[PDB]
Amino acid sequence: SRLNRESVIDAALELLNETGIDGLTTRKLAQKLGIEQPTLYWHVKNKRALLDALAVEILARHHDYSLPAAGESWQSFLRNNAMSFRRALLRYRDGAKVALGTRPDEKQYDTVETQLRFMTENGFSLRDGLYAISAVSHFTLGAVLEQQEHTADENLPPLLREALQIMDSDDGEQAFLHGLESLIRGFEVQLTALLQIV
Amino acid sequence: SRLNRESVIDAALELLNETGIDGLTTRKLAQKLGIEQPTLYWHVKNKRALLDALAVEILARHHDYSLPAAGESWQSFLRNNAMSFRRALLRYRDGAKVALGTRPDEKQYDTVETQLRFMTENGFSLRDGLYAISAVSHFTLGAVLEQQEHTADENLPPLLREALQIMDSDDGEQAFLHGLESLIRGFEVQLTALLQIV
Ligand SMILES: C[C@H]1c2cccc(O)c2C(=O)C2=C(O)[C@]3(O)C(=O)C(C(N)=O)=C(O)[C@@H](N(C)C)[C@@H]3[C@@H](O)[C@@H]21
Ligand SMILES: C[C@H]1c2cccc(O)c2C(=O)C2=C(O)[C@]3(O)C(=O)C(C(N)=O)=C(O)[C@@H](N(C)C)[C@@H]3[C@@H](O)[C@@H]21
Ligand SMILES: [Cl-]
Ligand SMILES: [Cl-]
Ligand SMILES: [Cl-]
Ligand SMILES: [Cl-]
Ligand SMILES: [Cl-]
Ligand SMILES: [Cl-]
Ligand SMILES: [Cl-]
Ligand SMILES: [Cl-]
Ligand SMILES: [Cl-]
Ligand SMILES: [Cl-]
Ligand SMILES: [Mg+2]
Ligand SMILES: [Mg+2]
């Protein structure tokens, strides 16, 4: 079929959904695109190369809250950013595993530069703003992995039994949204304190 | 060599370190133990079975702060628990990927039951205490994955350039320890508030 970048990414995202990350292969991608393995090699060198591009394109297609509104608070921006990051990552099977260990792409520079600039213009040192960004990113990544990977007893002590009932009664959105408010409020306590002991 | 549970786990943890999770196989485990694949099958059915046991044994060997001291605060317990969880997970390559999506083992029941009980005896509803436990777990899991997986440009805009310098200047312990204080303080704000608007 068509082998421009857009079409190779479309097929690679379908395959990721049917098979997951550990069963995504250049052999199986060649099969789905209707082509021979050496035809594929011209366009895509290895699994790593593909994985890097998939991390970028999932957010381009599905991460709609990358940038703060005019007048929006930093707290609100982190809330709306995190929910949109979580949605984009749940959209494909092992989506969060695809995003793991990547660094901003050249095509994300203007966007992530605007994000860091926004945090500094709201009173964070670059280092403290980055610590807040990284903590929201890591918490969200952790929550999506545990949910997604989870999809992949008679003598339960009583509080564990009820806790497992609580977890199994929801997809994880409730625990996620509660955790995010705790994180955002902790950053606020830290920022407002300045040089006071807190 | 010896094929009792302890010895199969020793070998599987070595192999995990040389090869990572995605390259851990029953074929390669059989090779390292000096045995044929059907000899292995009697002791270990599949990769999933192995992965479940490895998650348990990494914490048994290396997770030394499972339980609070006499008189210890809940804040202190979560701090000391999280640092010990992080250490145990960094001890092997893709350690955090091994722990992902598992639920307490029968051999962890008394331990995790004591943990949930401790949170309730410090004023948390079971649901709110579980939300705090899950948030600390997810943040830690996220931070270790990004660090571990990361191990697996000339026109950098200026704040991203300095932020990447900041991340590359440390193994991730600094960002982790800062994030954990923000999370613990947010739970405290939430718990103390009770039915007040906060
Ligand atoms: C500033 C970025 C950064 C800086 C230095 C080292 C890094 O590893 C990063 C990132 O990895 C970021 C992301 O991945 C984003 O998810 C990211 O790239 C991104 C985006 N493309 O819109 C986000 O929404 C961000 N968000 C918190 C989930 C986040 C970025 O802010 C950071
Ligand atoms: C209470 C446990 C729980 C309850 C209900 C559903 C669950 O999925 C869990 C866990 O997965 C827990 C862990 O994995 C621990 O890491 C876990 O098993 C554990 C331990 N074996 O010592 C910990 O130290 C805990 N810690 C926060 C990292 C944590 C457990 O508290 C929870
Ligand atoms: Cl074709
Ligand atoms: Cl075509
Ligand atoms: Cl083409
Ligand atoms: Cl294209
Ligand atoms: Cl491959
Ligand atoms: Cl032998
Ligand atoms: Cl022997
Ligand atoms: Cl034996
Ligand atoms: Cl044994
Ligand atoms: Cl296997
Ligand atoms: Mg990232
Ligand atoms: Mg767990």
How far is Cα B133 from Cα A185, in angstroms, rounded to an integer? 17
Rounded to 5°, the CA angle B147-B149-B154 comes to: 80
- Name the minimum distance, in Å, from the CA of A63 to any CA of chain B: 19
Q: Which ligand approaches the C-alpha of residue B57 most closely?
A: 2
- All residues of chain B having their beta carbon less than 8 Å from the beta carbon of residue A100 are 145-146, 149
How far is Cα A46 from Cα B166, in angstroms, rounded to an integer? 30
Same domain, A54 and A96: no
Same domain, A114 and A182: yes
Q: What is the domain-level CATH number for residue B49?
A: 1.10.10.60
Are A167 and B133 a contacting pair, CB within 8 Å?
A: no
- Which residue in this structure is represented by tokens 């049917």? A18
Are B26 and B11 a contacting pair, CB within 8 Å?
A: no
Q: Which ligand approaches the C-alpha of residue B63 most closely?
A: 2
- The DSSP symbol for B106 reads G
> Does A113 lie at the interface with B, CB-CB under 8 angstroms?
yes
Same domain, A97 and A150: yes
Of B128, B146, B158, the CB nearest to A100: B146
Domain C-terminal end among A65, A84, A105: A65
Centroid of chain to Cα A191? 25
Centroid of chain to Cα B50? 17
**Which experimental method was this entry solved with?**
X-ray
> Does B148 lie at the interface with A, CB-CB under 8 angstroms?
yes
**Domain containing A98: what range?**
66-197
Same domain, A14 and A100: no
- One-letter amino acid at A38 equals P
Same domain, A43 and A79: no
Rounded to 5°, the CA angle B92-B97-B100 comes to: 125
How far is Cα A119 from Cα A103, in angstroms, rounded to an integer? 19
Tell me if B130 and A164 make a contact (CB, 8 A cut-off). Answer: no
Same domain, A141 and A80: yes
Rounded to 5°, the CA angle A159-A165-A169 comes to: 145
Centroid of chain to Cα B24? 19
- Which residue in this structure is represented by tokens 């990447």? B164
Same domain, B78 and B165: yes
Q: List the alpha helices (DSSP H) in chain A.
A: 5-19, 26-33, 37-43, 47-62, 74-90, 95-99, 109-120, 126-151, 158-168, 173-193
Same domain, A31 and A125: no
> Does B18 lie at the interface with A, CB-CB under 8 angstroms?
no
Which residues, including other chains, have CB under 8 Å from residue A37's CB and lie 6 or more apart? Answer: A26, A27, A30
Q: Note residues around ion ligand 6 (Cβ under 5 angstroms).
A: A 4-6
Mark residue B95 as left, alpha or beta (left: phi above 0; alpha: psi -120 to 50; beta: remaining).
Answer: alpha
How far is Cα A128 from Cα B1, in angstroms, rounded to an integer? 52
Are B18 and B92 a contacting pair, CB within 8 Å?
A: no
| Smallest CA–CA distance from A153 into chain B, residue | B106
Tell me if B166 and A100 make a contact (CB, 8 A cut-off). Answer: no
Q: Residues A43-56, buried b or exposed e (16+ Cβ, 10 A)?
A: bbeeeeebbebbbb
Same domain, B56 and B98: no
Is residue B54 within 6 Å of ligand 2 at its C-beta?
A: no
Domain C-terminal end among B65, B85, B103: B65
Tell me if B146 and A138 make a contact (CB, 8 A cut-off). Answer: yes
Secondary structure element (H or E) that encloses residue B60, with its range: helix B47-62
Q: What is the domain-level CATH number for residue A117?
A: 1.10.357.10
Query: How many Å from the N-terminal Cα to the C-terminal Cα in chain A?
Result: 61
Whole-number CA gyration radius for chain A: 20
Half-sphere exposure in the Cβ direction for B189 (13 Å, CA): 21
How far is Cα A146 from Cα B100, in angstroms, rounded to an integer? 6
- One-letter amino acid at B103 equals R
Same domain, B166 and B112: yes
Give nearest CA residue, ligand 2 atom 12. B104
- Which residue in this structure is represented by tokens 């381009």? A60
Resolution, in Å, please?
2.0
- Which residue in this structure is represented by tokens 């008394």? B110
Domain C-terminal end among A65, A82, A98: A65
- All residues of chain A having their beta carbon less than 8 Å from the beta carbon of residue B190 are 181-182, 185
Same domain, A78 and A44: no
- Three-state SS string over A90-117 comes to HCCCCHHHHHCCCCCCHHHHHHHHHHHH
Same domain, A7 and A96: no
Half-sphere exposure in the Cβ direction for A43 (13 Å, CA): 21
Are B95 and B144 a contacting pair, CB within 8 Å?
A: yes
- One-letter amino acid at A65 equals Y
The rounded Å distance from CA A137 to ligand 1 centre is: 7
User: How many domains would you assign to chain A?
Assistant: 2
> Does A14 lie at the interface with B, CB-CB under 8 angstroms?
no
